[PDB]
Structure 1
Amino acid sequence: VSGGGKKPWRQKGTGRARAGTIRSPIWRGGGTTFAAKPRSHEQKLNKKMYRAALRSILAELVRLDRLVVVADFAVDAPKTKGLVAKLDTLGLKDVLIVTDGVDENLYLAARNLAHVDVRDVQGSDPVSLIAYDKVLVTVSAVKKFEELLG
């Protein structure tokens, strides 16, 4: 904190409490006692200890009847209206779409759509699979989960 070099008053004789600098943590405009610096809140999670949670999450979606499996999922030309109609046939509003590869047409649509996300098998994190009300996977994406998760 700027300033605060010399003693405000002398050590003895003035009848005031001892001071050494005007920028002391006790004073009004002084510094912070344990002032923060930028740092990283990064933890370590084992490779196998992360894959066991994916296995546990995926097993709970099947038990809770949130996982929906379909034979391929694609759209022609990027149109939010076109993707909205196709999800209504499956009866899904707040859905996470998982595919083996995110097509450009499917990515452009559903980008502005509110409660819909399109992801990848290796892009699907623990948080998203718990957050959305349904998870819609394709057959190719299922055969890829068993490869990565054993």
Structure 2
Amino acid sequence: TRGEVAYSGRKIWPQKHTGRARHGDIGAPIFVGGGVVFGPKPRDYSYTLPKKVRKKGLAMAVADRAREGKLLLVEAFAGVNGKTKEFLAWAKEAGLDGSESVLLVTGNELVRRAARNLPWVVTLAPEGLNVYDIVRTERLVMDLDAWEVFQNRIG
């Protein structure tokens, strides 16, 4: 600000018989080296959104997917080992051919690893379900041991 800058506090003109404008320090914000007037100060932007609004959001975020037809509930991932070979061979027989992006919600980290690294999968933990990561993808595929934690998480 005007006060925080590393200038001085000396009145740079004696204000009366100079003829130029009356000015305080160079650190005044109208000077070109000066501070800024109202520039941003580092603040936390996060706020408590109500927990019922978060739960209703994560309900309607998957309700949109089920209302379209872009929801899938697999349990047995045939792709063990986290090989993206195994995951893409799984997706070919599953019905996620790759042109439409998918949120992948699995409690199996060795398929989160497989789908971590594609241009069309947002991998996700079963607890880290959230409406922004739901909506930014066009499909949703989740495990039975992620749908169970989601169903008992929301009302």
TM-score, with length taken from structure 2: 0.84
Partner of residue 115, structure 1:
120
Please state whether the residue corresponding to 1:135 is helix, strand or coil.
Answer: strand
Structure 1 residues 30 and 147: alpha-carbon distance in aligned structure 2, compared to 1, 3 A threshold: same
Q: Is it true that 1:149 corresponds to 2:145 in the alignment? A: no
Q: Is it true that 1:27 corresponds to 2:34 in the alignment? A: no
Q: Unaligned regions of 5+ residues in structure 2, if any?
A: none
Please state whether the residue corresponding to 2:131 is helix, strand or coil.
Answer: coil
Partner of residue 108, structure 2:
102
CA distance in 2 between counterparts of 1:147 and 1:22 reads: 62
CA contact (8 A) 1:72 1:140 kept: no
Q: Aligned to 1:80, which of 75, 80, 84?
A: 84
CA contact (8 A) 1:74 1:106 kept: no
Structure 1 residues 11 and 51: alpha-carbon distance in aligned structure 2, compared to 1, 3 A threshold: same
CA distance in 2 between counterparts of 1:19 and 1:29 reads: 13
The count of corresponding residues between Structure 1 and Structure 2 is: 148
Structure 1 residues 20 and 142: alpha-carbon distance in aligned structure 2, compared to 1, 3 A threshold: closer
- The structural deviation recorded for 1:51 is 0.5
TM-score, with length taken from structure 1: 0.86
CA RMSD of aligned residues (A): 1.8
Question: Sequence identity of aligned pairs in percent?
Answer: 36
- The structural deviation recorded for 1:74 is 4.4
Q: Is it true that 1:2 corresponds to 2:31 in the alignment? A: no
Q: Is it true that 1:12 corresponds to 2:12 in the alignment? A: no
Structure 1 residues 107 and 63: alpha-carbon distance in aligned structure 2, compared to 1, 3 A threshold: closer
